[PDB]
């Protein structure tokens, strides 16, 4: 009901393009509330069009679901405007997406951050599973940085909302994240919590490689074949076997032998209490989590929502 | 807790726009840039007017630690300091500005629910300070900030004695004594500022004379939109006997009861349309701009 605000074009304006993806383009926007003199920064995503004649009531029905997620590590859909285009509004994250972030800070990112991000993504996915929601497009590009200490999963439900043609399954770099999908999703369009776990495995690989592209050079139309031959992403240079073993367990053919998200929370949290034993990174001692003074300052300005503490080295 | 006050360097922030001035200094909109990042985070900066020596900065710094230690949804927390030649204080930017200029700009477009809820929230904020045995000394409509129209916060705590006759209690004018009950006096003047949509108290009466007219029993007039039950509360805050003025705890309860029957205690033209936002609008505001936890506001019955 009340969790989702219906906007009109008169009360917001796209100000500047931030990025473009398969689901649409994201603009920095301004909400201009009824009868006020302020401009509030917002993020606006104008979606490309769904491959299905989507009734507005069922666009709104999906959006209410998206507006109902209440968890520190999943972004909640705040508003929608249904005109010629479908435009979604939510809180602007000035730090951008986690894939761009790890690429840009490749040389100054330590084990404590990498492992805590793992935990927080797993926490956000565990929430979705408890709500019986399947993301279908979990990836590092779909994790946003609210602060460097706080990441949140975005864009859930949009894969099932917009769908995709069958041509973009059998084609290179399109609207279907073939190289992030479990084999059963590629072959049969089967999407469960356990194939979200597969995508979580690929997401962790992106982070541990500081933003490498998975299976680069192998055409997307061939990924289904190499997966059935047993080929998987290689062990990132900074990962001990403990971390690589978890990754490979997520890419097992039999879905129900993959780990559960709740298990992944527990093991990545264990590893975050002694991060130097599980990731080998040069200069890792010259990189720490923020001090208490710095986290209190970050939170009071920009991140006031309830959140569990980051897992620190004992 | 020394970890509640960040010591800023000049290199990591910049003043962008002037937002206003005050008895204590000049207020800027600024941008904080964290080290190693490329983002620009808006902040409010207050630059004090007088320059200070190292010995004077030590007294300022320890007072700042107390300001940084206030934690309540209706009192603004001091977040940082930069000890230059001329001191600068940093807190979170309240984009809707100060309530004084807000009510002046929205004169005949503010419903009764907003006014009474602002009085509840201000009282809650002062009651927190009293509970911590902290005296504001400069409560006024210009020192209540608007985070959202539904959420206001007292600012500038502790600045007064660290470094407003027509807001002060008689005992403070005559003998420079400041107590929680003198804060209650200025609460009444603040409520008077709100109800007249930002009129100037005791207009055209020189500050040198306020002492003497108060002695003779002259008090600010009944605002036109106020029922006599609102005005009597205000009148109780301006009694010469400090301890028979209302207590901040009692004001929360009184205005909250009134906030549930808002149109019987304030009579406003066109009030049948200025209701506080639906749950939908209020959820939007909070997820977008105001994620801190705060008790619900008092809606009608
Ligand atoms: C990883 C790619 C990316 O999103 N980069 C990026 C660059 C600049 C930015 O502004 C500071 C942001 N902020 C941001 C983005 C989003 C968002 N990102 C995506 S990519 C799949 N999709 C969205 C989005 C926006 C609005 C909605 F209603 C739903 C989804 C969201 C908030 N802040 C990011
Ligand atoms: C009535 C005057 C006023 O404050 N106006 C105003 C106009 C625009 C604004 O943002 C768009 C804000 N936001 C704001 C103001 C302040 C602040 N006001 C004062 S008046 C004496 N003092 C402060 C302040 C700033 C920083 C500190 F560390 C302490 C006190 C604070 C936050 N947002 C206001
Ligand atoms: Cl996208
Ligand atoms: Cl001032």
CB contact under 8 A, A293 and B5: yes
Sign of the alpha-carbon dihedral angle for B71, B72, B73, B76: negative
**Are the C-beta atoms of residues A42 and A115 closer than 8 Å to each other?**
no
Environment class of residue A96 by beta-carbon count within 10 Å: exposed (0-12), middle (13-18) or buried (19+)?
Answer: middle
- The set of residues, in sequence order, having a beta carbon less than 8 Å from that of B248 and lying 6+ positions away, is B123, B126, B127, B130, B180, B183, B184, B187
d(CA B139, CA B143): 6
CA distances from residue A206 to A97, A152, A177 in whole angstroms, order as listed: 13, 16, 14
Nearest to A122 by CA among A180, A66, A203, A238: A203
Which strand (E) or helix (H) includes residue A59? helix A56-66
Which one of B106, B279, B291 has the shortest CB-CB distance to A305?
Answer: B291
d(CA B154, CA A205) in angstroms, rounded, equals 48
- Tell which phi-psi region holds residue A184, choosing left (phi > 0), alpha (psi between -120 and 50) or beta: alpha
Q: How many residues does chain B have?
A: 301
Q: Which residues of A are catalytic, by number?
A: 137
Q: Where are the domains of chain B?
A: 1-93, 94-271
- The answer to whether the beta carbons of residues B24 and B163 sit under 8 Å apart is yes
Which residues partner with B145 through β-bridges? Answer: B98, B153
* Tokens matching residue A184: 């059963």
Q: Is-contact A133 A156, C-beta < 8 A?
A: yes
Q: Nearest Cα to B122, choosing from B221, B248, B286?
A: B248
Q: Alpha-carbon torsion B107, B112, B116, B121, what sign?
A: negative
Using an 8 Å Cβ cutoff, are A227 and A177 in contact? no
Residue reference for tokens 């089967």: A190
Report whether CATH 3.30.200.20 matches the domain A1-92. yes
Residue owning tokens 């009148």: B235
Burial of B260 (0-12, 13-18, 19+ CB in 10 A): middle
For the four alpha carbons of A247, A248, A254 and A260, in that order, the dihedral sign comes to negative
Collapsing DSSP to helix, strand or coil, A186 comes out as helix
Tell me if A2 and B280 make a contact (CB, 8 A cut-off): yes
Ligand nearest to the CA of A18: 1
Which positions in chain A touch B290 (Cβ < 8 Å)?
304
Query: DSSP string covering B222-242, please?
Result: PPTTB-HHHHHHHHHHT-SSG
Ligand nearest to the CA of B140: 2
Shortest Cα–Cα distance, B92 to chain A (Å): 5
Residue listed under structure tokens 């009466």: B205
Q: Using CA atoms, how far apart are residues B32 and B137, in angstroms rounded to an integer?
A: 30
A79 membership: H or E segment, kind and range: strand A79-82
Write down the H helix ranges in chain B.
54-67, 99-105, 112-131, 159-162, 170-175, 180-195, 210-215, 228-237, 248-260, 262-265, 279-289
Q: Using CA atoms, how far apart are residues B248 and B180, in angstroms rounded to an integer?
A: 8
The tokens 């439900």 sit on which residue?
Answer: A157
Beta carbons of A92 and A41 less than 8 angstroms apart: yes
Going across the sheet that includes A12-20, the strands are A5-6, A79-82, A86-90, A40-47, A24-31, A12-20
Residue nearest to atom 4 of ligand 2 (CA): B98
Catalytic entry in B71, B101, B108, B138: B138
By three-state DSSP, how is residue B295 classified?
A: coil
> Ligand 2 pocket check: which of B155, B156, B159 to mutate, most ligand atoms within 8 Å of Cβ?
B155
CATH of domain A93-284: 1.10.510.10
Count how many residues are written for chain A: 314
CB–CB of B41 and A292 under 8 A? no
The closest of B233, B150, B222 to B184, measured between CA atoms, is B233
CA–CA dist B186, B242 (Å, integer) = 12
B95 lines ligand 2 (CB under 6 A): yes
**Phi/psi at B122 (5° precision):** -65, -45
Find the discontinuities in chain B where C to next N exceeds 2.5 angstroms and give the residue preceding each.
163
Bridging pattern class, strands B151-154 and B144-148: antiparallel
Query: Which tokens belong to B213?
Result: 């007219």
- Whether A143 contacts A75, CB under 8 Å: no
The coordinates were experimentally obtained by: X-ray
Q: What share of chain B is helix, strand, coil (3-state, %, to 5)?
A: 45, 15, 40
Cβ distance of B95 and A40 shorter than 8 Å: yes
C-alpha dist (Å) from residue A112 to A271, A282, B297? 9, 13, 40
Burial letters for A181-218: b for 16+ Cβ neighbours within 10 Å, e otherwise?
bbbbbbeeeebbbbbbbbbbbbbbbbbbbbbbebbeee
Closest ligand relative to A26 C-alpha: 1
Supply B151's token pair: 């959420």
CA–CA gap between residue B25 and residue A267 (Å, rounded): 52
Alpha-carbon distance B146 to B160, whole Å? 21
Alpha helices in B132-179 (DSSP H): 159-162, 170-175
Q: Quote the DSSP letter at residue B266.
A: B
| CA–CA distance, B117 with B252 (Å, rounded to integer) | 10
B126 HSE (CA, 13 A, CB side): 32
Cα(A95)–Cα(A86) distance, integer angstroms = 25
The minimal CB distance from A301 to the residues B79, B95, B293 is found for: B79
The position carrying tokens 């999703």 is: A185
- CATH class in words for B94-271: mainly alpha
Beta-sheet pairing, A143-147 with A150-153: antiparallel
Contact yes or no for B238/B172 (Cβ under 8 A): no
Ligand 3 ion: residues within 5 Å (CB): A 21, 23
**Do residues B26 and B99 lie in contact, with contact meaning Cβ atoms separated by under 8 Å?**
no
Task: For residue B56, give both structure tokens.
Answer: 């004077």
Q: How far is the CA of A142 from the centre of ligand 3 (A)?
A: 8
Adjacency order of strands within the sheet including B80-82: B6-7, B80-82, B88-91, B41-48, B25-32, B13-21
Specify the 3-state DSSP secondary structure of A194.
helix
Q: E strand or H helix at A153, and its extent? A: strand A150-153
How crowded is residue B3: how many other Cβ atoms within 10 Å of its Cβ? 13
CB contact under 8 A, B4 and A296: yes
DSSP B110-121: --HHHHHHHHHH
CA dist A213 → A124, A139, A216 (Å): 23, 11, 6
In the reported structure, the alpha carbon of residue B201 is separated from the centroid of ligand 1 by a whole-number distance in angstroms of: 49
- Distance (angstroms) between ligand 2 centre and the Cα of B102 equals 12
Neighbouring residues of A110: CB distance < 8 A, sequence distance ≥ 6? A275, A281, A283, A284, A287, A288
Q: Say how far apart CA B3 and CA A300 lie, in whole Å.
A: 12
**Helical pair B248-260 and B228-237, crossing angle rounded to 10 deg:** 170
Q: Could you identify the atom of ligand 1 that is nearest to the CA of residue A89?
A: 28
Pairing, β B144-148 against β B80-82 = unpaired
Separation between Cα atoms, residue A278 and residue A109, nearest integer Å: 15
C-alpha–C-alpha distance, residues A289 and B70, integer Å: 25
Cβ atoms < 10 Å from Cβ of B300: 12
How far apart (Å, rounded) are the C-alpha atoms in residues B297 and B295?
6
Tokens of A109: 């990112």
- Give residues with Cβ within 8 angstroms of A282, minimum separation 6: none
- Sign of the torsion formed by the C-alpha atoms of B153, B158, B159 and B164: positive
For ligand 4, a single-atom ion, the residues with CB < 5 A are: B 22-24
Q: How far apart are the first and last CA of chain B?
A: 42
Residues A43 and A92 sit within 8 Å (Cβ to Cβ)? yes
Distance CA B48, CA B56 (A): 13
φ, ψ dihedrals at B44, nearest 5°: -105, 130
Give residue ranges of B with CB < 8 Å to any A CB: 2-6, 32, 34, 36-37, 39-41, 43, 77, 79-80, 92, 95-96, 105-106, 109, 149, 278-281, 283-284, 287-293
CATH code of the domain occupying B1-93: 3.30.200.20
Q: B215, B197, B12: which is closest to B102 by C-alpha?
A: B197
């Amino acid at each position: 009901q009340a969790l989702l605000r219906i906007l009109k074009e008169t009360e917001f304006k796209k100000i500047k393009v931030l990025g473009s993806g398969a689901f649409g383009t994201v603009y920095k926007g301004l909400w201009i509330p009824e009868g006020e003199k302020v401009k509030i920064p917002v993020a606006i995503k104008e979606l490309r069009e769904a491959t299905s004649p989507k009734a507005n009531k069922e666009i709104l029905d999906e959006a209410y679901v998206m507006a109902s997620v209440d968890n520190p590590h999943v972004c909640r859909l705040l508003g929608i405007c249904l005109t010629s285009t479908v435009q979604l509004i939510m809180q602007l994250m000035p730090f951008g997406c986690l894939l761009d972030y790890v690429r840009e800070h490749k040389d100054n990112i330590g084990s404590q951050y990498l492992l805590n991000w793992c935990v927080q993504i797993a926490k956000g996915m565990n929430y979705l599973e408890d709500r019986r929601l399947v993301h279908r497009d979990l990836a590092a590009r779909n994790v946003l940085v609210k602060t460097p200490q706080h990441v949140k999963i975005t864009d859930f439900g949009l894969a099932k909302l917009l769908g995709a043609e069958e041509k973009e399954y059998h084609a290179e770099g399109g609207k279907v994240p073939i190289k992030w999908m479990a084999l059963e999703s590629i072959l049969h369009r089967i999407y469960t919590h356990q194939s979200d776990v597969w995508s979580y495995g690929v997401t962790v690989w992106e982070l541990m490689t500081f933003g490498s592209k998975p299976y680069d050079g192998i055409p997307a139309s061939e990924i289904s074949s190499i997966l059935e031959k047993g080929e998987r992403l290689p062990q990132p240079p900074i990962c001990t076997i403990d971390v690589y073993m978890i990754m490979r367990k997520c890419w097992m053919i039999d879905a129900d032998s993959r780990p559960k998200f709740r298990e992944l929370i527990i093991e990545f949290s264990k590893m975050a209490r002694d991060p130097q034993r599980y990731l080998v990174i040069q200069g890792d001692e010259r990189m720490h989590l923020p001090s208490p003074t710095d986290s209190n300052f970050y939170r009071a300005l920009m991140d006031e929502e309830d959140m569990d503490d980051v897992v620190d080295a004992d």
